[PDB]
Inverse folding.
């Protein structure tokens, strides 16, 4: 499963281009972001190429993701609820209805 | 304790201009990233 | 099974493809997304953009001249942030509209 | 679910309602004041 | 709930702008209707403004 997802991660920069669908193009992640950024948004090339290091705000976002994986992060709570769901019926419903 | 709290829906309200020239709201910061759904 | 169909679409819509969509992607403009497995399913890390410092600037619609080859501009003429002196390739040439001297 | 839906609905800069929207356009969607006219009808 | 619908009506003209979904511009409903009429249908300014 990690093999599948790591191939996906590798494919990101190549697949994400005007190219189209699968036609991946081996491209650096940096260039991929600056194209996605000059294209989805109206930030001009001068704002991106002349001054970069927006990398720092990117990495702050990634770090906050990494630091807080606690339940209060609402999304992580749903994963716990799904696990509690199937444990509930398998671990409890069966055991209590056979005692 | 201390009941009665009521929030508000006000956003950032740009105003329409009678003149042909029109005001628009433009940002100065990037603030990227968020935690997402499962 | 239905939500798995949603997962297949989510990866194609946000991760593998780019944004240019307003509904099946991360908050604000969507820049990139990542996936990792999770208990019983996938886990999504959509990465977005956020404005956060809006400034109200008056802007003319278009630019004509004596003649009328209008160029479709913060007000003398500025071509998400900062100002640019010359359009060069930024301004196209559509047909004219009302309230002349500008497309207005 | 309600709270989540409403948050997605807004997140936008809105011009304050002016009883005249488009020129020569007629909008029942305005507020009389509290629950615009078409909402009252349904 | 009404506050939300009123906010949506106010932002309908501005949000319907190609440059940005978040980016907003003070704009009349009339001009927005003409841009939308050109946006999917291709009746040009000559058909619309006249």
């Amino acid at each position: 499963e990690a093999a599948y997802t790591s191939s996906l991660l590798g494919s990101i920069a190549g697949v994400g281009w005007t190219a189209g669908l699968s036609s991946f193009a081996a491209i650096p992640f940096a260039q991929s972001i600056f194209y996605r950024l000059n294209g989805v948004g109206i930030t001009q090339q001068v704002l991106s190429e002349n001054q970069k290091l927006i990398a720092n705000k990117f990495n702050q976002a990634l770090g906050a993701m990494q630091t807080g994986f606690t339940t209060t992060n609402e999304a992580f709570q749903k994963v716990q609820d799904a696990v509690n769901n199937n444990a509930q019926a398998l671990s409890k419903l069966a055991s209590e209805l056979s005692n | 304790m201390r009941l009665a709290s009521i929030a508000f829906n006000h956003p950032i309200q740009v105003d329409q201009l009678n003149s042909s020239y029109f005001k628009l709201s433009i940002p100065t910061n990037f603030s990227f990233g968020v935690t997402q759904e499962y | 099974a239905l939500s798995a169909q949603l997962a297949k679409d989510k990866v194609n819509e946000c991760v593998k493809a780019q944004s240019k969509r307003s509904g099946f992607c991360g908050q604000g403009t969507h820049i990139v997304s990542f996936v990792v497995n999770a208990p019983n399913g996938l886990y999504f890390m959509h990465v977005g953009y956020y404005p956060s410092n809006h400034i109200e600037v008056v802007s003319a619609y278009g630019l004509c001249d004596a003649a009328n080859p209008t160029n479709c501009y913060f007000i003398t003429n500025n071509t998400d942030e900062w100002s640019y002196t010359g359009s060069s390739f930024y301004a196209p040439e559509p047909i004219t509209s009302l309230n002349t001297k500008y497309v207005a | 679910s309600v709270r989540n839906l409403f948050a997605s609905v807004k997140s936008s800069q809105s011009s304050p309602i002016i009883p005249g929207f488009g020129g020569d356009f007629n909008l029942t969607l305005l507020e009389p004041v509290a629950r615009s006219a078409i909402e009252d009808l349904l």
Summary: The CA atoms of residues 34 and 40 of chain D lie 10 Å apart. The helical segments of chain D are 2-9, 37-41. The interface with chain B takes residues 10, 12-16, 18 of chain D (CB under 8 Å).
